[PDB]
Amino acid sequence: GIVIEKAGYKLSIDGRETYIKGVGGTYRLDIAAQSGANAFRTWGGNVEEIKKNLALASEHNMYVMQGIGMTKDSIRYYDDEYKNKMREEVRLLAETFKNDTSLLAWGIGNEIELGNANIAAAWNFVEELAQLIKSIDKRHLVSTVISYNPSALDSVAKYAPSLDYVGINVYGPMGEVQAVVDRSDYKGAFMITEWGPTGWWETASTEWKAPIEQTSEEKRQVYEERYTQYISANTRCLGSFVFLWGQKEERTPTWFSMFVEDKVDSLPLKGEKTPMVEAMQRVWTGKELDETAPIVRGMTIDGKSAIDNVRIKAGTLFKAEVSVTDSLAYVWEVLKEATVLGFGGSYEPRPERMGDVAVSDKNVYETMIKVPGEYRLYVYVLDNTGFVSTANIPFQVID
Amino acid sequence: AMGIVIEKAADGYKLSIDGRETYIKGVGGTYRLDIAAQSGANAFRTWGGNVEEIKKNLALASEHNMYVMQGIGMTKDSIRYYDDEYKNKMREEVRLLAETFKNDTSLLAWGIGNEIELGNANIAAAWNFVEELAQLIKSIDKRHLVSTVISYNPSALDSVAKYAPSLDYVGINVYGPMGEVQAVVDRSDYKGAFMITEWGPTGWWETASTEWKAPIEQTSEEKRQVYEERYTQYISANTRCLGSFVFLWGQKEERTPTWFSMFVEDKVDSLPLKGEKTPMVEAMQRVWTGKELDETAPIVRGMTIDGKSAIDNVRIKAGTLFKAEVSVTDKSLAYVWEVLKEATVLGFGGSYEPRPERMGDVAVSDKNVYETMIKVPGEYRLYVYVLDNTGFVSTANIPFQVID
C-alpha cells in the first residue's frame, strides 16, 4: 500500500502518510537515522548489492529509492540486444525484490536526457521498463530521475505516463523549481533526488577568482532555508535526498561536504558531523536540538575578511582568528587554491598542503608562507561531542 | 623484439610497436574516429567494456589503423580492496580479458583503473591489487603494455612508485594548467615513462570573468593556439611522455556548449549545426602530423555587442535592439547566432549539465552582424558559429547582462 494521492500530492505507506526525508548514498546511515532521516537513494547495484542496501535500510528503519543504471550511449536504445538485456535485468530485480518492505521505489535511469542525444527511443524504453516493473512488482513506486531541465519534464509527460513520480536533481539556486515544474507539461508528484548548499558559481569570489566559501553557520542556514522554502513548502514535492551526506573534494574539501575528512595523512580529523547535519536534524524532526555545533560567526587574517582580498607579503607573519559564539580545539591547515577541477568529470585531487597542520586551544593562529601564490587557510572548531564547525579564508602571498 | 615495449632512451623513454618507435597521438573516446584518423591520430582511449564491447572497440581501431588504450573499471568503494569476493571476481574478469585479447594488434595497453586514489580512501590494499592485476595480465599477455591512470596527484605518483613496479607506464589525467606537469613527475618517486591520458584547453576557472562572474570563453582561434601550445610545450617536449589523449573529442555541455568541445552540437532542436569540426581539430592535425594544412577554418579575431568586447561587461537595457559583429580574417561564410541564459545548473560532484535555456530563436545570416533584443533582465551569452563550406565551424561568444 505505497500510494501517491491528490490532496498537490501526499504519499502513504500501508495507510501511513510519510514524507521522504532522504540522504544521497549510504555513508554513516547511523547518523542519518539518529538525525531523523527515513530514506536513502542509490544509483545502481546488482541483486547482491541491492540485498545489502535493503538490509542496511532495514537495520536503520529507512526506505530505499533504488536506482537502475541506463546507458548514455543513445544508439543502444535502437538495439534489441541492449533492450533485451535490460528487460531481463529489470524482470529479475522486480521478481526478487517485489515483497521487500525497505524498498520504496525504482529509479529507472539518472539524467538519460544528458546522453549522446535526447531521443524518443530512450524515453519510450523508460516507459517500457516501467510497464515491465509494474507487471511484476505491485508494491513499489516507479520513477525516473532527470536534470533540472524543462525539456526533460516535457519528455516525461509525453513519453512516460506509467511513472508514479519524477526525481529532479537540482544543483545551484532552487527559487525557480516550483515555477519550472508548474509551467512544464508534467502533471504529478516529484521528489528532489539531489539538492544541497550554495554552489561555488553562486558565491562572491576574490579578485583572483577564488570562490568565497560560507562558514558552517552560513551553510546550516542555507540547508534549512532551501528545505523549508523549496522542498517542504512545495505541495507537489513528496521528499528529497540531500547532498553531500559524506565528504568529497569539490573546489575545497569542505564546499558541499556534510562531514569533514577522515584518515587524511597528518590531519587529525575523524569524519566529524557538522552544523549541516544539525540543519537536517532540525528540519527533518521539526524539533529543537539538545546538542548543537559551535557557531562560527566569521574568520580574519590581520583583521581582514575573505571579501577584503587578503594579500600577505612572502616571509611575513600573519595572524588568523576565528570568531565563535570553551573546551574547544582548533585545527588549522593551509592548502593551495585548487587548480585541478572536475572538467567533464566528478573527481578532483586534494590541493597540496603548505607547511604542517597546527592544533591550538585558542581561536588564533599565526604563520608565515615564503612562496608567492594563492592559498586558503582552513579552520576546524571541534567541541567534545563529535561536532566540527568550519570556515576558511582565501589569501594571496605576494613578493 | 615483437610486441609493445618501452625502453630507456638517451633522454627519457621511447615506445616501440614491433621494433618501430611510435608516438601515441590519441583522442579520448570513440566519437568521429574517421576525422581523428584523417587528422593524423593513431590511438584512442576507452574507460571500460565487457569482451563484446572491447571486440567492437578493437574492430573500429583496426578499420582506422589506430591503437587502443583499453580501460578496466576498478571500484572507488575502497573497502572492496580487502574483500576476496571482489578481488576473485576482478581476477577472473582480467584473466578472461588478457586471454581473449593477448594477440590483438589494435590493442596497445591495458589501463587498470581510472583515478583509484580518489575513491573513498587512497590505501595500500588498492595499489597492491593494481600490482597483482598487472602481474596477472603480464603472465598471459606478452604483447601489450600495462598501466594505471591517476589524477594529477603527487601522492598518487608516489603510491605507484611504492606499490606497482610491474606497471610499464602511468597515465596522468591533467585538467587546468599544464606548465608544472614536467616538474611534478620529475620531483615524484615515480621513475618511468608516462602518458597524459586526459588533457585539453583552458579551464573556466583559469580565464577572466565578467563583473557578474560569467567566465569569458576563448574564441576558436584562441583555443586552437592553446591546444597547439600545450601539446608542443608540455607533451611532445617531455622526453618521459610517450603520448597523450586529447579532450573533448566530441561535444558535451561544460559551462557552455562550446567550452571544451572540439566538435559543435548535432541534432539540437531548431539549431542548424551538424557536429562540424572546429579550429581545435585543425590544431591537433597540425601538431600530430607536424605538417601545414591544405584546408583551415575561419579565423575568428573577436566579437562585439554595440562595439564592446566580453571584457567590457556589456550591459543592454531590456527591450532595446543591440548589434553583434564577429570579426573573421577575410578568405561565402554563413553565421549562426544563438542567445542562451548564462548557465546556473553546473556539475556539482556530478559530470552532466543540462543545456541552458534559449532566449528567442536561432538566426542564420550571410553577413558577420546580427541584431536582436532581450525583454527579460538577466545574464545571457550570445553565441556565433561561422561555417565555411568545407565542414569547419569557428566560434566565439560574449556574455552580456540585460538591465531594467
Numbering used by the authors:
A (entry chain B): 25 to 31, 34 to 351, 356 to 429
B (entry chain A): 23 to 353, 357 to 429
Manuscript text:
Through a systems-based approach, here we show that the symbiont Bacteroides uniformis deploys a single, exemplar polysaccharide utilization locus (PUL) to access yeast β(1,3)-glucan, brown seaweed β(1,3)-glucan (laminarin), and cereal mixed-linkage β(1,3)/β(1,4)-glucan. As exemplified by the β(1,3)-glucan utilization loci (1,3GULs) elucidated here, PULs encode concerted molecular systems of surface glycan binding proteins (SGBPs), carbohydrate-active enzymes (CAZymes), TonB-dependent transporters (TBDTs), and sensor/regulators to recognize, capture, import, and saccharify individual substrates. (ii) BuGH158 is a strictly specific, retaining endo-β(1,3)glucanase with a triose phosphate isomerase (TIM) barrel fold. Whereas BuGH158 is a highly specific laminarinase, BuGH16 is a generalist endo-β(1,3)-glucanase that can accommodate backbone β(1,4)-glucosyl linkages (as in MLG) and long/frequent β(1,6)-glucosyl branches (as in EbLam and yBG).
BuGH158 consists of an N-terminal (α/β)8 TIM barrel domain and a C-terminal, eight-stranded immunoglobulin (Ig)-like domain in contact with helices α7 and α8 of the TIM barrel. Additional loops contribute to the extensive contact between domains, with one from the Ig-like domain extending above the TIM barrel to shape the active-site cleft. A Dali structure similarity search returned members of clan GH-A as the top 20 structural homologs, confirming the bioinformatics prediction that GH158 constitutes an evolutionarily distinct family within this clan. Clan GH-A members present the conserved catalytic acid/base and nucleophile residues on loops immediately following strands β4 and β7, corresponding to E137 and E220, respectively, in BuGH158. Additionally, a conserved asparagine (N136) precedes the general acid/base (E137) and is anticipated to engage in hydrogen-bonding interactions with the substrate. Indeed, site-directed mutation of N136, E137, or E220 to alanine completely abolished catalytic activity (data not shown). The active-site cleft surrounding the catalytic sidechains is rich in surface-exposed aromatic residues oriented to engage in stacking interactions with the substrate. Crucially, this superposition also reveals that 6-OH of the glucosyl residue in the −1 subsite is oriented toward a pocket lined with aromatic residues that may accommodate a single β(1,6)-linked glucose branch in BuGH158. Indeed, a glucosyl residue could easily be manually docked into this position without clashes. This structural feature provides a plausible explanation for the strict LdLam specificity and poor activity on yBG, the latter of which contains longer β(1,6)-linked glucose branches.
